[PDB]
Amino acid sequence: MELYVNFELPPEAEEELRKYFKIVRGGDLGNVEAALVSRITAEELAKMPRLKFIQVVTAGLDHLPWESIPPHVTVAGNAGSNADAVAEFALALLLAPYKRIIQYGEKMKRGDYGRDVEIPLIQGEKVAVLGLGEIGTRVGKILAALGAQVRGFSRTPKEGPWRFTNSLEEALREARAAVCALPLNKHTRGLVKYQHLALMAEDAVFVNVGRAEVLDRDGVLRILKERPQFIFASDVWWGRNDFAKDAEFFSLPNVVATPWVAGGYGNERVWRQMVMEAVRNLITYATGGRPRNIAKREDYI
Amino acid sequence: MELYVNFELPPEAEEELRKYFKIVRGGDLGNVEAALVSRITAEELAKMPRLKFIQVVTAGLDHLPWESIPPHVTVAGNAGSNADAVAEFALALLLAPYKRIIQYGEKMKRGDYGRDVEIPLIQGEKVAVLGLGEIGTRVGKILAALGAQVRGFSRTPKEGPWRFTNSLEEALREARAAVCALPLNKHTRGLVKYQHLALMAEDAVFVNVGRAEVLDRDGVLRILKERPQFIFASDVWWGRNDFAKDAEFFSLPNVVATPWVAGGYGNERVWRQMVMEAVRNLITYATGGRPRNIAKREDYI
Numbered sequence: 001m002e003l004y005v006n007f008e009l010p011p012e013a014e015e016e017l018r019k020y021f022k023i024v025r026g027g028d029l030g031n032v033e034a035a036l037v038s039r040i041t042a043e044e045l046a047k048m049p050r051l052k053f054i055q056v057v058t059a060g061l062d063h064l065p066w067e068s069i070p071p072h073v074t075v076a077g078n079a080g081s082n083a084d085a086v087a088e089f090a091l092a093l094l095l096a097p098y099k100r101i102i103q104y105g106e107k108m109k110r111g112d113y114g115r116d117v118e119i120p121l122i123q124g125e126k127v128a129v130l131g132l133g134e135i136g137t138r139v140g141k142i143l144a145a146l147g148a149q150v151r152g153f154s155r156t157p158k159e160g161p162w163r164f165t166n167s168l169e170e171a172l173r174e175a176r177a178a179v180c181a182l183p184l185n186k187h188t189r190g191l192v193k194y195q196h197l198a199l200m201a202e203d204a205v206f207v208n209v210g211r212a213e214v215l216d217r218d219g220v221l222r223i224l225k226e227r228p229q230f231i232f233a234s235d236v237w238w239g240r241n242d243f244a245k246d247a248e249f250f251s252l253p254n255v256v257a258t259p260w261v262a263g264g265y266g267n268e269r270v271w272r273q274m275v276m277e278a279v280r281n282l283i284t285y286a287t288g289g290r291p292r293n294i295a296k297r298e299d300y301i
Numbered sequence: 302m303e304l305y306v307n308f309e310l311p312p313e314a315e316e317e318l319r320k321y322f323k324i325v326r327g328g329d330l331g332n333v334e335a336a337l338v339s340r341i342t343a344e345e346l347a348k349m350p351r352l353k354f355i356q357v358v359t360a361g362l363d364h365l366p367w368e369s370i371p372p373h374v375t376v377a378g379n380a381g382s383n384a385d386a387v388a389e390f391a392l393a394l395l396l397a398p399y400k401r402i403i404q405y406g407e408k409m410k411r412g413d414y415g416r417d418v419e420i421p422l423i424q425g426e427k428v429a430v431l432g433l434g435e436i437g438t439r440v441g442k443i444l445a446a447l448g449a450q451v452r453g454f455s456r457t458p459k460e461g462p463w464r465f466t467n468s469l470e471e472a473l474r475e476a477r478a479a480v481c482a483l484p485l486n487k488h489t490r491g492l493v494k495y496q497h498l499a500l501m502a503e504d505a506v507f508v509n510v511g512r513a514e515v516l517d518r519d520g521v522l523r524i525l526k527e528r529p530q531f532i533f534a535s536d537v538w539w540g541r542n543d544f545a546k547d548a549e550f551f552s553l554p555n556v557v558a559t560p561w562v563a564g565g566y567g568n569e570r571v572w573r574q575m576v577m578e579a580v581r582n583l584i585t586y587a588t589g590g591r592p593r594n595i596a597k598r599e600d601y602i
């Protein structure tokens with residue numbers, strides 16, 4: 001189970017991977033079966049004779065090659081490794097435009113001191129939360145604790161402080177806000193569409209904090225151009241790291257945008273934690289433990 | 302019992318008041334034993350010899366003449382009538398600048414897509430909360446629930462999810478944030494001073510949602526001009542409704558400002574509710590019960 005490191009592992013992250021395995025970032029690899037990576041090229045794969053499994057330090061899996069994959073090796077990723085960080089980021093992403101903080105701050109700066117914009121309340125409000133558990137759940141918990149009529153959506157039922165649904169639609173219905181945190185698989189691609197978004201209040205604020213591809217880019221753009229009061233606040237984009245590609249969104253007055261920094265690429269501590277959290281997981285993929293987050297090819301096929 | 306009323310009353314309120322009082326909005330006020338106002342001048346106070354109770358709609362009472370209110374009049378205010386509204390507003394006021402939403406949104410707009418700014422975490426962070434109960438408390442509970450090391454400050458001890466203190470100073474010490482919601486009396490005037498503020502992290506976010514006078518205006522200005530990373534986010538100002546007077550703050554890049562709209566003057570629903578609650582307290586007074594929020598005169602002298 002010699003270990004292959006696709007990137008830079010900090011001290012502990014390393015000096016805790018030596019109490020076990022080989023370490024291999026150079027020369028041939030044959031006889032590794034390791035993992036610990038962020039991304040993977042079909043190339044790096046074929047150049048690693050017989051691999052046991054694969055451990056992505058991320059929390060998503062939609063990027064990984066797939067076709068160039070052994071229907072056996074299985075994948076053990078993270079998730080909840082950054083649940084807290086991303087959680088609080090989505091709340092900020094929601095309240096900033098929701099309580100009209102950003103808007104009024106602008107008016108103040110320009111000299112406008114009128115109170116012509118009404119401040120929406122969260123209490124007693126219908127708020128959707130697409131994607132439950134880890135992130136979705138922490139958000140849902142807080143919204144509810146703030147007095148919101150949270151309507152949690154998800155594939156497998158079972159929940160808590162909210163009216164769970166199995167229809168993204170019925171959660172967005174007349175909803176005044178939504179915090180999306182769905183993972184991106186073949187079932188989540190272009191899931192939320194114009195028609196769905198349009199079921200929300202014309203005044204709504206839609207927060208996206210998980211993969212952007214979950215929303216039909218064209219739909220978002222369209223509703224944004226129709227409903228001035230509709231706000232799209234997202235830390236994730238279709239341009240996935242390019243950004244420049246989605247600049248047409250950033251120039252819309254009703255859009256709040258952050259560079260995919262909701263924890264992970266935005267906070268060093270969170271990164272190290274995600275890593276030391278991959279550490280403790282790799283470890284068990286030997287000590288015959290339980291492979292947490294094990295994927296399922298067919299969800300992506 | 303005649304009740305004086307000097308402001309537009311929601312139909313819901315008038316209906317109820319008429320079952321208990323003889324509303325009077327002008328003419329001879331000699332038999333008024335009344336109350337119910339938002340503001341009151343000494344000119345009005347002189348016309349009400351028999352005034353024995355004064356129910357204020359707002360949560361604070363510093364704006365009242367006091368020096369013109371006979372010492373036996375009994376003044377009860379609201380409070381908690383807008384606790385939730387103001388509560389969520391403070392969180393928004395905190396998270397917007399804290400999680401760097403406002404700042405990154407700007408960078409995105411200008412084309413800057415770098416991730417050079419680290420995103421602070423709330424979890425495990427030292428957060429002060431000057432003023433407990435009603436607003437202070439709701440804020441404190443949420444911060445704590447987000448994993449913050451909340452340090453609640455207040456006059457009379459007794460609390461919950463936090464390390465209560467009786468020294469504003471020891472709460473701000475190396476604190477990364479503060480949500481101020483103190484009422485303004487003779488003990489809170491210029492309470493927080495430069496020296497105290499300076500005990501916070503040079504990277505701190507100070508949120509003021511209660512009366513501004515509680516902070517020494519010059520101190521705020523000074524620390525803001527010294528610590529670029531230090532942020533002052535407030536919905537209340539020394540200019541008290543003028544704003545123009547505090548324009549020098551709005552032009553500082555490390556200030557977030559809103560026009561005193563944290564519920565009340567910012568949301569119609571919240572206003573109506575404050576009025577209904579005021580009308581309810583007045584009625585219990587009328588029916589011989591103990592009205593809530595009786596003011597302790599010496600707090601304002």
Ligand SMILES: NC(=O)C1=CN([C@@H]2O[C@H](COP(=O)(O)OP(=O)(O)OC[C@H]3O[C@@H](n4cnc5c(N)ncnc54)[C@H](OP(=O)(O)O)[C@@H]3O)[C@@H](O)[C@H]2O)C=CC1
Pocket residue numbers: 360361362379380381383384387432433434435436437438454455456457458482483484485486488489510511512536537561562563564565
């Ligand atoms: N900006 C805005 O939109 C609004 C701001 N406000 C402000 O908030 C205040 C109401 O706050 P709220 O949360 O509702 O609570 P209560 O309404 O009045 O506030 C009482 C709390 O603060 C404490 N307190 C009062 N005086 C002092 C003091 N001198 N030193 C230390 N603690 C003190 C109390 O201690 P104890 O119990 O010992 O007195 C208690 O914890 C108003 O008076 C007003 O100034 C209100 C509404 C809207």
